[PDB]
Amino acid sequence: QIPASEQETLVRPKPLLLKLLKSVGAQKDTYTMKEVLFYLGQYIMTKRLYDEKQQHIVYCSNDLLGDLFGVPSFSVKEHRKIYTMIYRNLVVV
Ligand SMILES: COc1cc2c(cc1OC(C)C)[C@H](c1ccc(Cl)cc1)N(c1ccc(N(C)C[C@H]3CC[C@H](N4CCN(C)C(=O)C4)CC3)cc1)C(=O)C2
Ligand SMILES: [Cl-]
């Protein structure tokens, strides 16, 4: 399980991630990983990108999120994978 310290990491989103974050209310130059995770969470929730019957699976093949992550789908239970996909879309300060 990922160290709690990682969510305190200061990050600067790349342009596509920044675009997505701004669509869920982001106003900042710099975020914590915790903030990024929560904004992306709200994006998934608001748009209902998760399967109605298999609710842990996020489907994003027809969404900007899929461009960002380079996958058609992923499980929210894949925590290391989620960190990796997010980190590839930002610059650690
Ligand atoms: C601070 O750390 C974290 C914050 C957050 C997450 C992970 C974190 O850390 C880990 C990486 C270690 C993840 C998340 C997942 C991926 C990314 Cl790309 C981004 C965020 N998340 C989140 C997002 C979606 C879902 N989904 C999609 C499943 C439910 C199942 C239950 C379902 N239902 C069942 C029926 N009813 C009646 C309900 O009320 C709820 C709703 C969907 C669950 C959690 C967040 O919100 C914020
Ligand atoms: Cl989209």
Curated annotation (Swiss-Prot):
Comment field on protein domains: Region I is sufficient for binding p53 and inhibiting its G1 arrest and apoptosis functions. It also binds p73 and E2F1. Region II contains most of a central acidic region required for interaction with ribosomal protein L5 and a putative C4-type zinc finger. The RING finger domain which coordinates two molecules of zinc interacts specifically with RNA whether or not zinc is present and mediates the heterooligomerization with MDM4. It is also essential for its ubiquitin ligase E3 activity toward p53 and itself.
Full protein segment contained here: 18 to 110 of 491
Function: E3 ubiquitin-protein ligase that mediates ubiquitination of p53/TP53, leading to its degradation by the proteasome. Inhibits p53/TP53- and p73/TP73-mediated cell cycle arrest and apoptosis by binding its transcriptional activation domain. Also acts as a ubiquitin ligase E3 toward itself and ARRB1. Permits the nuclear export of p53/TP53. Promotes proteasome-dependent ubiquitin-independent degradation of retinoblastoma RB1 protein. Inhibits DAXX-mediated apoptosis by inducing its ubiquitination and degradation. Component of the TRIM28/KAP1-MDM2-p53/TP53 complex involved in stabilizing p53/TP53.
Start and end residues of each stretch annotated as Sufficient to promote the mitochondrial pathway of apoptosis: 1-84
Induction: By DNA damage.
Tissue spec: Ubiquitous. Isoform Mdm2-A, isoform Mdm2-B, isoform Mdm2-C, isoform Mdm2-D, isoform Mdm2-E, isoform Mdm2-F and isoform Mdm2-G are observed in a range of cancers but absent in normal tissues.
Other notes: MDM2 RING finger mutations that failed to ubiquitinate p53 in vitro did not target p53 for degradation when expressed in cells.
Name of protein: E3 ubiquitin-protein ligase Mdm2
Post-translational modification (record): Phosphorylated at multiple sites near the RING domain by ATM upon DNA damage; this promotes its ubiquitination and degradation, preventing p53/TP53 degradation. Autoubiquitination leads to proteasomal degradation; resulting in p53/TP53 activation it may be regulated by SFN. Also ubiquitinated by TRIM13. ATM-phosphorylated MDM2 is ubiquitinated by the SCF(FBXO31) complex in response to genotoxic stress, promoting its degradation and p53/TP53-mediated DNA damage response. Deubiquitinated by USP2 leads to its accumulation and increases deubiquitination and degradation of p53/TP53. Deubiquitinated by USP7 leading to its stabilization.
Family: Belongs to the MDM2/MDM4 family.
Domain SWIB/MDM2 span(s) in chain numbering: 9-92
Residue numbers spanned by region Necessary for interaction with USP2: 1-93
Disease: Seems to be amplified in certain tumors (including soft tissue sarcomas, osteosarcomas and gliomas). A higher frequency of splice variants lacking p53 binding domain sequences was found in late-stage and high-grade ovarian and bladder carcinomas. Four of the splice variants show loss of p53 binding.
Subcellular location: Nucleus, Nucleoplasm; Cytoplasm; Nucleus, Nucleolus; Nucleus
Subunit structure: Interacts with p53/TP53, TP73/p73, RBL5 and RP11. Binds specifically to RNA. Can interact with RB1, E1A-associated protein EP300 and the E2F1 transcription factor. Forms a ternary complex with p53/TP53 and WWOX. Interacts with CDKN2AIP, RFWD3, USP7, PYHIN1, and RBBP6. Interacts with ARRB1 and ARRB2. Interacts with PSMA3. Found in a trimeric complex with MDM2, MDM4 and USP2. Interacts with USP2 (via N-terminus and C-terminus). Interacts with MDM4. Part of a complex with MDM2, DAXX, RASSF1 and USP7. Part of a complex with DAXX, MDM2 and USP7. Interacts directly with DAXX and USP7. (Microbial infection) Interacts with herpes virus 8 protein v-IRF4.
Superkingdom field: Eukaryota
